[PDB]
Design a protein around this ligand. Structure first.
Ligand SMILES: O=C(O)CCCC[C@@H]1CCSS1
Length: 330
């Protein structure tokens, strides 16, 4: 029918991600999907980050910690088995975000916990010592569909991300969480799955069998095998470190940018751009128009700025980029 209920039985974060990417882009928004999963120890970076700058890869290797590059913008995120995770997808105009939020809150409520929406992402519980975050999430609407996923903090090690990242000095020179463990001592991932599952089946008035997917056999999602292959490949997750002879970076209110490149005979011969900005598009397309560019403040500014007409949301981002570059050349 309409509802699909997908339960990963696998801690493999490339498998879980592929599944996530299949929902966003393979499944028809004719379905209403709840997907519940969790990853073993993993840093997940945004698609335009450079992990050889951002992460302590040596420690990661030593401590056996996985890397995975999601396909969306933004920065690095930790996972362990003490995070329970949820993905909802459904089609429009039927579905908006308040729906999945509703479902999660009910389920928390059904666990003895009352929490609520704090800001645009998180859910928070009210505490004698103030607001304390239990759940981060992220949302996007598309043409045919909306998509919502997030994490519930059951028993995560928070502070671990620190040891796998690297000192970013500029990001440094420029700048409240609790586990459920602490409130319900016996709470399991399975238990927190039933809860959400029911709040889900409650909202829609129906139930369906759970599909227990794991990577030892193809889940029933179109093009999964290709999707899992790419998503798990070293070249996608890591990629070679960038090797060029010039570097420019800067931290901005809206993110860090490293710009790498070569100059021969006064023009750029190759160039690459990383960032942790929520939307990397306009940087991605910047590197795109920087190849061949006359290496001089005026042309760099010119190329940067021709991008405006197709990035009206990001006009400030571009302006500051332009400015920065001009000032940064000599
Ligand atoms: O992580 C973010 O900041 C954006 C998440 C947007 C969800 C997309 C749907 C399938 S994987 S990426």
């Amino acid at each position: 029918s309409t509802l699909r209920l997908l339960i990963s039985d696998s801690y493999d974060p490339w498998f879980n991600l592929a599944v996530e990417e299949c929902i966003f882009r393979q499944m028809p928004a004719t379905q209403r999907v709840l997907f519940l999963w969790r990853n073993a120890d993993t840093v997940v970076i945004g698609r335009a980050q450079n992990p050889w700058k951002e992460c302590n890869t040596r420690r990661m290797e030593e401590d056996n910690v996985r890397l995975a590059r999601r396909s969306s913008g933004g920065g690095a995120v930790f996972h362990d088995l003490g995070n329970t995770c949820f993905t909802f997808m459904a089609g429009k105009p039927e579905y908006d975000k308040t729906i999945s939020t509703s479902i999660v809150l009910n389920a928390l409520n059904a666990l003895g916990v009352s929490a609520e929406a704090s800001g645009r992402n998180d859910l928070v519980v009210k505490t004698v010592e103030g607001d304390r975050k239990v759940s981060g999430s992220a949302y996007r609407e598309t043409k045919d569909r909306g998509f919502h996923h997030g994490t519930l903090l059951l028993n995560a090690d928070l502070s671990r991300l620190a040891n796998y990242l690297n000192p970013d000095k500029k990001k440094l020179a420029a700048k409240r969480v609790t586990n459920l463990t602490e409130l319900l001592p016996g709470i399991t991932h399975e238990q927190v799955c039933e809860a959400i599952t029911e709040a889900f089946f409650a909202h829609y008035g129906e139930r369906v069998e759970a599909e227990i997917i794991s990577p030892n056999k193809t889940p029933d999602l179109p093009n999964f095998a290709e999707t899992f292959a790419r998503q798990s490949s070293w070249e996608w997750n890591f990629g070679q470190a960038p090797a060029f002879s010039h570097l420019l970076d800067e931290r901005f209110t809206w993110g860090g940018v490293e710009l790498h490149f070569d100059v021969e005979k006064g023009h750029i011969t190759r160039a690459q751009v990383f960032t942790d900005s929520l939307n990397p598009a306009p940087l991605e397309a910047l590197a795109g128009r920087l190849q061949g560019c006359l290496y001089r403040a005026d042309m760099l500014q010119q190329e940067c700025e021709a991008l405006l007409v197709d990035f009206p949301e990001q006009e400030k981002e571009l302006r500051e980029l332009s400015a920065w570059m001009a000032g940064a050349v000599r």
